[PDB]
Amino acid sequence: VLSAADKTNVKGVFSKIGGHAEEYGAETLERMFTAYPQTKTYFPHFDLQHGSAQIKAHGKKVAAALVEAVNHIDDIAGALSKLSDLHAQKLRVDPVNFKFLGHCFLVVVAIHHPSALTPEVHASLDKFLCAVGTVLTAKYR
Amino acid sequence: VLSAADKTNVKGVFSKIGGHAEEYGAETLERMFTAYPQTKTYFPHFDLQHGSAQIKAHGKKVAAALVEAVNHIDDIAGALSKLSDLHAQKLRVDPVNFKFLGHCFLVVVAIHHPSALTPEVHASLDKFLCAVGTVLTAKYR
Amino acid sequence: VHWSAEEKQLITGLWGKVNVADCGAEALARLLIVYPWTQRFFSSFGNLSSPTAILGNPMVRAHGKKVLTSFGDAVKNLDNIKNTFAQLSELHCDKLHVDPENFRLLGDILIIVLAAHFAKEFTPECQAAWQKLVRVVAHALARKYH
Amino acid sequence: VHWSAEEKQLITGLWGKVNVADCGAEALARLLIVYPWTQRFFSSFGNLSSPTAILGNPMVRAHGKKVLTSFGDAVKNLDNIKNTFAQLSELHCDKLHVDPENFRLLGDILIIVLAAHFAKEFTPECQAAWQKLVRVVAHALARKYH
Ligand code: HEM
Ligand code: HEM
Ligand code: HEM
Ligand code: HEM
């Protein structure tokens, strides 16, 4: 799973992001809706055009959860158990969408911090995003 | 994950199999090689034609591991950690193949025990096979 | 795709002994119960709260039957599957927005349902003939993408 | 597939500024390091023991370049991708036996590599234009199946 080494890489790239976390959370959501249109289906109540005060408001929330799962990377399952019911039970989000969001988040940190997303770090970050994805779809298996 | 209910279902269907475990392990491997030919790639040293004393010998091994992970369903990760290195490190088995084997195992118990593989039990068994699949590819994420 | 002669024989034979209603209902009921997130696309069906409810829901049974009848159409035109399912590709993709990975899951469940209705008559070569069918139908549906 | 006019412009533009060698090498090196089981198909490349070794391996760099040059061929015949990659579909599928889900992974990494080489010039609409390309090429390769 998340090796002591992996945990180090994740925390590292999350410290170079720090303040921008929020901005990055909104950019990731915008790319998702643009590159993977089918995801707009889950946000019928949002103003999905670039800029929307909602997409930004939500992007903050998403980023915040990530930053918070990073501080509990030793127990991501418990630091997000609340979001599991919302995603798996109420919303019934198809598991594939999680791969999409994760891929867009990488594309983001790669645009803003290329020299930080070294192949070794990429490998770690991808394991970390998969964990989150798993925990949020946990009420499935 | 594996709910107390899920654990009950798995143990249940594994007790109705009991003695046949071995036969079922060989039938599952035969269907895999027939329905998913690309898996034969991992057994270049085997006599892959129906009946082979090797496919039967191996089918026993596979079934045995399942029966043994069922007795430690509370800690499947530890009752199979040994097989993880072989599958993930040395053999480098593509994660998809695990879905295949699992699907063939279900097709088997469904041929021999239809009335036991009720939709509710199917759901459990599939969660259990996914766990095993995960633990055996663990040295990946 | 290239359909071997045995495959056609194997596909057609078995198909004639299929109870479209009981199987279709069971296959779709299992999809919803084993992969719950699929319940999302069937809100218009009413109550899917528990497995026992999904099992009894009149529209699930009613729809399951239509789904398997659809496979029948593919079994009648093995060489013309791409077209037979052109309009359905629009509905699943453009209208409903279903991810192709779920077309793959239903086919896999169908295979398990068939296995339980035919027992040993469902030989490995037969399974392989059907996996293939289930695959091409799935691609035929996910055509309207890439 | 239907190629919008902007998409072509977006795909072609960016492509002309791509360093086939550095990018190809980096994209393939990442594939092997992030999804290790892919190392299985490259045993003939020698040492892939550690990431630093994969990064330096002369044949990985050498091959990465050929892979991206291949994408170039697709960028030159957007409307003729199915054919351009017919022979490669035989090699990956019938010869090597690669699972199509891995064609999808390489394309996704390529996208991340491109994103890191162009920064903000890699706009969301651009990402979407490339995801699509990466997809059709992946299907074009997995044609020789179903
Ligand atoms: C690793 C990725 C994800 C994280 C960290 C995450 C996190 C969150 C958070 C913090 C909320 C709850 C905020 C609140 O209480 O209002 C939320 C809501 C929600 N999430 Fe996720 N989520 C993720 C992935 C997804 C995906 C892939 C989808 C589906 C395409 C999705 C769709 C939703 C929806 C529809 C809501 C409701 C928002 C609203 O109604 O305003 N989420 N998510
Ligand atoms: C849940 C499924 C699986 C279980 C329970 C399992 C279990 C086992 C066991 C017990 C052995 C080691 C026996 C020994 O020490 O000789 C083994 C070996 C091996 N497994 Fe798996 N395995 C699984 C899936 C796979 C898959 C999907 C593949 C690849 C298509 C695979 C390929 C192999 C190979 C190539 C060996 C070597 C056998 C030999 O060289 O004789 N296994 N597996
Ligand atoms: C891979 C095999 C599949 C086949 C052959 C198939 C076939 C069909 C057919 C023939 C119809 C009925 C047309 C009508 O009466 O309007 C239909 C409708 C529909 N399908 Fe599928 N389908 C497949 C998979 C799926 C999957 C995986 C989902 C989602 C989990 C899905 C969701 C729907 C929905 C919600 C409708 C329409 C509901 C309504 O009209 O009220 N289908 N499908
Ligand atoms: C989806 C994009 C892909 C493209 C466009 C692509 C392209 C190519 C091309 C053009 C060649 C070189 C032909 C030659 O010089 O003989 C090749 C060879 C090969 N590809 Fe791919 N490939 C793709 C994905 C993959 C993946 C995912 C794997 C496996 C993880 C793979 C494994 C191989 C191997 C092992 C060879 C031949 C090795 C050798 O000749 O020594 N390819 N590929």
Curated annotation (Swiss-Prot), chains A, B:
Question: Which positions in this protein are listed as binding heme b?
Answer: 87
| Iron as UniProt keyword | yes
Q: Name one GO molecular function term.
A: heme binding
User: Where does tissue-level expression of this protein occur?
Assistant: Red blood cells.
Q: What is said about its interaction partners and assembly? A: Heterotetramer of two alpha chains and two beta chains.
Q: Does the keyword Ribonucleoprotein apply?
A: no
Instruction: Could you list this entry's UniProt keywords, alphabetically sorted.
Output: Heme, Iron, Metal-binding, Oxygen transport, Transport
Pfam name, any one: Globin
Which Gene Ontology cellular component terms are annotated?
A: blood microparticle; haptoglobin-hemoglobin complex; hemoglobin complex
Q: Where does O2 bind?
A: 58
Give the Gene3D superfamilies listed for this entry.
Answer: Globins
Q: Which GO terms describe its biological process?
A: hydrogen peroxide catabolic process
Query: Can you give the residue ranges of the Globin domain?
Result: 1-141
Family assignment from sequence similarity: Belongs to the globin family.
Its protein name is Hemoglobin subunit alpha-A
Say which domain of life the source belongs to: Eukaryota
> PROSITE patterns this protein is in?
GLOBIN (PS01033)
- Which gene specifies this protein's sequence? HBAA
- Give a short account of what the protein does: Involved in oxygen transport from the lung to the various peripheral tissues.
From Swiss-Prot, chains C, D:
What is the protein name stated in its UniProt record?
A: Hemoglobin subunit beta
Name any one GO molecular function.
Answer: oxygen binding
Q: Which organism is it from?
A: Anser anser anser (Western greylag goose)
Gene that this sequence comes from: HBB
What SUPFAM superfamilies has UniProt attached to this entry? Globin-like
Recorded hits in InterPro entries, A to Z, give: Globin, Globin-like_sf, Globin/Proto, Hemoglobin_b, Hemoglobin_oxygen_transport
> Per the database record, which ranges form the Globin domain?
2-146
Tissues and organs where the protein is expressed, per its UniProt entry: Red blood cells.
Q: Which cysteines are joined by disulfide bonds?
A: none
Question: One biological process GO term for this chain?
Answer: hydrogen peroxide catabolic process
| Family membership noted in the UniProt record | Belongs to the globin family.
Quaternary context: Heterotetramer of two alpha chains and two beta chains.
Q: Which controlled-vocabulary keywords does the entry list? A: Heme, Iron, Metal-binding, Oxygen transport, Transport
Q: Binding residues for heme b, per the UniProt record?
A: 63, 92
- Which cellular component terms (GO) are annotated to the entry? blood microparticle; haptoglobin-hemoglobin complex; hemoglobin complex
Q: What is known about what this protein does?
A: Involved in oxygen transport from the lung to the various peripheral tissues.
